[PDB]
């Protein structure tokens, strides 16, 4: 029906699964993978 394309085309959904899993902070992986590699190097 057109009711589907009537709504999915105007809707303005702002949040979804991935936006919950993502940090909104500035913690990228430069400060994470660093220790991840260092502890492997200790092994």
């Amino acid at each position: 029906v057109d009711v589907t394309r009537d709504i999915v085309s105007r809707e303005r959904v702002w949040r979804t699964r991935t936006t919950i899993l993502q940090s909104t902070g500035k913690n990228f992986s430069k400060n994470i993978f660093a220790i991840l590699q260092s502890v492997k190097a200790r092994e």
Partner: protein, 459 residues
């Protein structure tokens, strides 16, 4: 959007008969702070009334009620959605703008509110009113099964979820909810991978939610004594590879580092777990996982305060204010008087909602024996205490008898209770000793008070 913001800051100061400027303001600010969008729709509502007597279109009262629905103004958002419905109903000639779709979205948000307004029945009825008029809608069909899922994972919740998938198999949300079905009963540990690898096709791929659900179902296989069989180590390394992958594609994926720190903690790298969980905490400490993992790192210092603080913070929610697992995590280093005697209280509070568990009935007995031997070994204790300790020891012995007949255990046979029974018998002998000590101290205090009373008679 930055250019849209900087243009809107130019239209906001000057007043060239601004009419839709606040609409475009709120249309960006609904991702940013929700109050800015609210202020913009608030002023846009009145700015649409000075030129003519024209009613507010339903789309604005709808968007503002949708803003307020995220807030605690649930009743106010409800009035907004009611007014949007009444207004969209009045749009008998807006067939181009499709007033009907506007009423559809408004009713959807309204049933979502009633679902959220502790009124599941109104949400049910509104969702059915969308089904009866438009069975090609998904979320109305899904939230309905969500409501029934509260009562149980086996009602028409599960059916409506599967039926939704059959109509729209390429709907990642319905599919994810499918895999969420199997998470109730974890007996589908290894077999969930097939159902999880369905939509892992390249057209879907980079679905971080599936990848993480995979790493989670893979992590559940950890905490096994088969690590020396080179079986859990490979599982750890595999999940670590998953996490590294979802890290390279999403450095901000806090659940990636969450599981990385989990496997490091299972590695005993609790300091490496500590600071990765700390970075998670800094980014978003609100999630139920950090309140646990962080407390489990702090408690591992044997000294702790934050652990019980974080256990308290996670229990603040109404979800499971009465909870057994939190007390099982907390029942640790139980030897301080405020840990021993208090943990009895929290074990009893847990058991009064879950009396059927063996582990509560076992740990309450272990803490009882810990206290009883903390006063029936050497202590020149208070007199009433040695009367009470033998009572507690008797009840511990009764539990020791009752536990031994139960078949199923905490995946660990309780055959080792014989040493608890021996401790019980020798604590009983110590009770029969310390009650003699009790009477000697009794006569001591009586002669002390008498020799004081005589001094008072002298005065």
């Amino acid at each position: 959007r930055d250019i849209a913001k900087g243009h809107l800051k130019k239209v906001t100061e000057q007043y060239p008969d601004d009419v839709e400027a606040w609409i475009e303001l709120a249309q960006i600010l609904e991702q940013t702070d929700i109050q800015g969008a609210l202020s913009a729709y608030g002023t846009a509502t009145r700015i649409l009334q000075e030129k003519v007597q024209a009613d507010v279109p339903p789309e604005i009262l709808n968007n503002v009620g949708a803003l307020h629905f995220r807030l605690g103004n649930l009743g106010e958002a409800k009035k907004y959605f009611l007014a949007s419905l009444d207004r969209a109903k009045a749009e008998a000639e807006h067939d181009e703008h499709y007033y009907n779709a506007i009423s559809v979205t408004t009713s959807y948000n309204l049933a979502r509110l009633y679902e959220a307004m502790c009124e599941f029945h109104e949400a049910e009825k509104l969702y059915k009113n969308i089904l009866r008029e438009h069975p090609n809608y998904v979320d109305c069909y899904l939230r309905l099964g969500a409501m029934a899922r509260d009562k149980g994972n086996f009602y028409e919740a599960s059916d409506w979820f599967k039926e939704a998938l059959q109509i729209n198999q390429d709907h990642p949300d319905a599919w994810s909810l499918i895999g969420n079905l199997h998470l109730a009963k974890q007996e589908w540990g290894p077999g969930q991978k097939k159902f999880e690898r369905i939509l892992k096709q390249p057209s879907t791929q980079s679905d971080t939610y599936s990848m993480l659900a995979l790493g989670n179902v893979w992590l559940q296989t950890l905490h096994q004594p088969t690590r020396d069989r080179e079986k859990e180590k490979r599982h750890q390394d595999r999940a670590l590879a998953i996490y590294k992958q979802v890290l390279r594609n999403d450095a901000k994926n806090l659940y990636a580092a969450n599981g990385i720190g989990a496997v490091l903690a299972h590695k005993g790298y609790f300091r490496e777990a500590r600071d990765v969980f700390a970075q998670v905490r800094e980014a978003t400490a609100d999630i139920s996982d950090v309140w646990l993992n962080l407390a489990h790192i702090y408690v591992e210092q044997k000294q702790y305060i934050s652990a019980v603080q974080m256990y308290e913070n996670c229990l603040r929610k109404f979800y499971k204010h009465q909870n057994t697992e939190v007390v099982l995590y907390l029942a640790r280093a139980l030897f301080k008087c405020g840990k021993l005697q208090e943990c009895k209280q929290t074990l009893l509070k847990a058991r009064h909602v879950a009396p059927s568990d063996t582990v509560l009935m076992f740990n309450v007995a272990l803490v009882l024996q810990r206290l009883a031997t903390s006063v029936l070994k050497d202590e020149k204790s208070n007199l009433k205490e040695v009367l009470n300790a033998v009572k507690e020891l008797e009840l511990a012995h009764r539990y020791f008898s009752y536990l031994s007949k139960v078949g199923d255990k905490m995946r660990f046979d309780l055959a080792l209770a014989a040493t608890e029974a021996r401790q019980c018998s020798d604590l009983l002998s110590q009770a029969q000793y310390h009650v003699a000590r009790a009477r000697k101290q009794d006569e001591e205090e009586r002669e002390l008070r008498a020799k004081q009373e005589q001094e008072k008679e002298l005065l």
